[PDB]
Amino acid sequence: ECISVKGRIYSILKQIGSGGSSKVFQVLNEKKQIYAIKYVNLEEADNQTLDSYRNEIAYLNKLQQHSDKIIRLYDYEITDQYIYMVMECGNIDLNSWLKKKKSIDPWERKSYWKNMLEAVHTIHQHGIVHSDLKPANFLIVDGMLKLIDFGIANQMDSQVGAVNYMPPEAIKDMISPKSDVWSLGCILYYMTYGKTPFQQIINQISKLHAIIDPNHEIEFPDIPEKDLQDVLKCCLKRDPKQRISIPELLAHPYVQIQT
Ligand SMILES: O=C1c2ccccc2-c2n[nH]c3cccc1c23
Numbered sequence: 137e138c139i140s141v142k143g144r145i146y147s148i149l150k151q152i153g154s155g156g157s158s159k160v161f162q163v164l165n166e167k168k169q170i171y172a173i174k175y176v177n178l179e180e181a182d183n184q185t186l187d188s189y190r191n192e193i194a195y196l197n198k199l200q201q202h203s204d205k206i207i208r209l210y211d212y213e214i215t216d217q218y219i220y221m222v223m224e225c226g227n228i229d230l231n232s233w234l235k236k237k238k239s240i241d242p243w244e245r246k247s248y249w250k251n252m253l254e255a256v257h258t259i260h261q262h263g264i265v266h267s268d269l270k271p272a273n274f275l276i277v278d279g280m281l282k283l284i285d286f287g288i289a290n291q292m293d294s295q296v297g298a299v300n301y302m303p304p305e306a307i308k309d310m311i312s313p314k315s316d317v318w319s320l321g322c323i324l325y326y327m328t329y330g331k332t333p334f335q336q337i338i339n340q341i342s343k344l345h346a347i348i349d350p351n352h353e354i355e356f357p358d359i360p361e362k363d364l365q366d367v368l369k370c371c372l373k374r375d376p377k378q379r380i381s382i383p384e385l386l387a388h389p390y391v392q393i394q395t
Contacts, residue, residue, distance in 0.1 A: 146171065227277065249327075300334060333354050
């Protein structure tokens with residue numbers, strides 16, 4: 137105990153996430169149903185930050201209706217000092233799950249992949265490119281991946297990280313939906329081969345040079361699922377024009393042909 141969002145009282149079971157100042161609490165309503173409550177402190181947010189927070193809240197609220205692979209947002213209270221967001225509660229985030237799991241069941245992987253496509257497809261269909269997709273951005277809810285954020289709000293402890301998932305065209309350019317495809321392709325590559333394509337290059341500068349270098353051959357060890365191979369090869373094509381799109385991925389035999 138205790139939080140109060142728009143009249144209704146919620147008792148704090150424990151803190152799932154910390155920050156930030158951004159704290160996600162596992163909580164229970166008056167009828168002991170389980171929710172998550174994200175608490176944000178606005179007392180040091182400037183006007184762009186605030187607007188970005190407002191913008192993402194608006195979209196998450198709208199895109200509720202369009203897919204159930206987008207995390208449910210049930211209600212929220214929002215003042216000048218804080219934000220409270222009553223949300224669907226989840227088992228574990230994908231990054232923590234992957235880290236702990238020894239190796240994924242081939243059926244489980246393909247199923248998660250469909251979830252990831254459905255959610256990312258939805259945000260694209262409203263002009264939203266995430267542009268920073270990591271396993272951390274996905275939540276396992278009832279054995280099912282859901283996208284937690286759209287990457288709008290978050291422009292506000294290591295030494296971390298996630299340069300592994302960075303597409304080459306973001307580096308050469310120093311928009312667009314193909315950037316998200318690359319990043320999803322790295323999440324799958326990880327679920328397939330246990331590491332990200334360039335994970336073993338532990339030097340940062342070297343890593344990026346490797347990502348943008350066309351002569352650097354990305355490895356794709358032979359595996360039973362030749363479908364999976366092909367999907368991985370298509371998402372990790374350095375020329376975004378050549379890269380496969382989400383609609384093409386949704387018509388791919390990997391997610392259609394059974395199984
Ligand atoms: O970050 C998490 C999170 C992290 C670990 C475990 C559960 C959750 C979780 N469950 N519901 C929500 C809503 C928003 C964010 C998050 C959740």
